[PDB]
Amino acid sequence: MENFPTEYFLNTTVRLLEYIRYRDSNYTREERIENLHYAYNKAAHHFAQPRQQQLLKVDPKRLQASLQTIVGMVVYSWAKVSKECMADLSIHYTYTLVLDDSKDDPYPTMVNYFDDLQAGREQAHPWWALVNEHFPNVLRHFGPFCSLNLIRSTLDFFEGCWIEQYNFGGFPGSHDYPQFLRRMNGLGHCVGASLWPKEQFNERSLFLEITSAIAQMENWMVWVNDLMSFYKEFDDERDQISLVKNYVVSDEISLHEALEKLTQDTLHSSKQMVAVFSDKDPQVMDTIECFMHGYVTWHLCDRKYRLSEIYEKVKEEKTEDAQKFCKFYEQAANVGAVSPSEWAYPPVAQLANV
């Protein structure tokens, strides 16, 4: 397919939004902006500190771009958590996003990882040094079980990045590779457990639902992301590996077949998500429904995924899908589309220079 599956894409997206029950929220734009700025402001000051500035080797521009995409992701999806929680999660997920930027071999700095860890010595790898120092600010919002999940997933993520450094799409015939890697760097368990602050949820009382939420949320979150990202990544000769591209290489199937597989998982995942949590604790179903919706809004509104382009193409096309799509889009935009100038300021560099 030298061309983007525009039709096919539009279809599944609508089906997906329908399945999850994509609709309006009592989360106003004035509320969204309130939070966006709160989160961004705390994070910005954090990354602007000299220590963070030294140890984190990231280009100023990308750091700004990353922080902004992450604050957005967090505020729009963790709708029911506190302002401080959105902020702290924003800092954590910004660190993770930034690590996918390093080309640097982890190996030499990981040689004494466990011995330093057990001894309480600052880690050799600067990233760990920063993240582990910051971690308590995130972990304070959760109980021990949810905390353990955040810790593991982040550790899993670190290995994932390491593996990704080899741009390996898996050996042909290695069917278990693709999902193995995707889970490794999807932060699924991190996301899943960070949805339940101990301030508004009892980890022990809701242990079974939380666990189930983590288990199911992990795959939904990553597959929805892989799907929504399929468009930007299509003509990106720079991005060589991805769940879909890897299915292709490892499963030895066509890109169509691979994209096919993703869609079946995504939709089935959606259907089962609702099936399971509808009749459960209302507060749980609420956090979950909001995350799914917010997560979708975010993808549709953040420039990174460039979905606006797909809009301004089928904008006046008159097929069923086409319209149901554009309708959903505009819905998002209403509370989603927000000029950065309304919340993301001043730039991190400016704060860093002061």
The annotated binding site for Mg(2+) is made up of 100, 164, 225, 229, 233, 239, 241
Bond preceding residue 346 cis, omega within 30 of 0: yes
135/92 Cα distance (integer angstroms): 7
CA–CA distances in Å: residue 242 to residues 206, 226, 279, 317, 323:
34, 8, 35, 30, 30
- Rounded CA separation 53/58 (Å): 9
Contacting range for Mg ion; rule: CB under 5 A; set: 10-18, 176-184, 200-208, 237-245:
237-245
Q: Examine residue 179 and tell whether it contacts Mg ion (CB under 5 A).
A: no
Nearer to Mg ion (CB atom), residue 35 or residue 242: 242
Minimum distance between the CB of residue 307 and Mg ion, rounded to whole angstroms? 17
Containing 40, the helix (H) or strand (E) segment is: helix 29-47
Name the residue with tokens 């591209």.
245
Q: Considering only residues 194, 242, 269, 270, which one is a binding residue for Mg ion as defined by CB under 5 A?
A: 242
Instruction: Kindly state the number of chain residues that form the binding site for Mg ion, as judged by CB under 5 A.
Output: 2
Closest separation in Å from C-beta 3 to Mg ion? 20
Q: Which stretch binds Mg ion (CB under 5 A): 3-11, 26-34, 72-80, 233-241?
A: 233-241
Tell me the window of 92-100, 202-210, 240-248, 252-260 that interacts with Mg ion (CB under 5 A): 240-248
Question: Which is nearer to Mg ion, 169 or 347 (by Cβ)?
Answer: 169
Indicate whether 239 belongs to the interface with Mg ion (CB under 5 A).
Answer: yes
Residue with smaller CB distance to Mg ion, 239 or 320: 239
User: Can you say which residues are annotated as belonging to the binding site?
Assistant: 100, 164, 225, 229, 233, 239, 241
Q: Provide the b/e sequence for 305-334 (b: ≥16 CB within 10 Å).
A: bebbebbeebeeeeeebbebbbebbebbee
Cα→Cα distances 31→36, 239, 338, 343, 351, Å = 9, 35, 12, 12, 25
User: Closest CB to Mg ion among 99 and 326?
Assistant: 99
Q: Does residue number 270 form part of the binding site for Mg ion (CB under 5 A)?
A: no
Asked if 255 and 244 touch (Cβ cutoff 8 Å), the reply is: yes
Smallest distance, Å, CB 229 to Mg ion? Answer: 8
How far is Cα 327 from Cα 246, in angstroms, rounded to an integer? 33
**Candidates 47-55, 88-96, 242-250, 339-347; binding stretch for Mg ion (CB under 5 A):** 242-250
Rounded-to-integer distance, Cα 326 and Cα 317, Å: 9
**Cβ-based nearer residue to Mg ion, 105 or 236:** 236
The residue ranges that bind Mg ion (CB under 5 A) are 239, 242
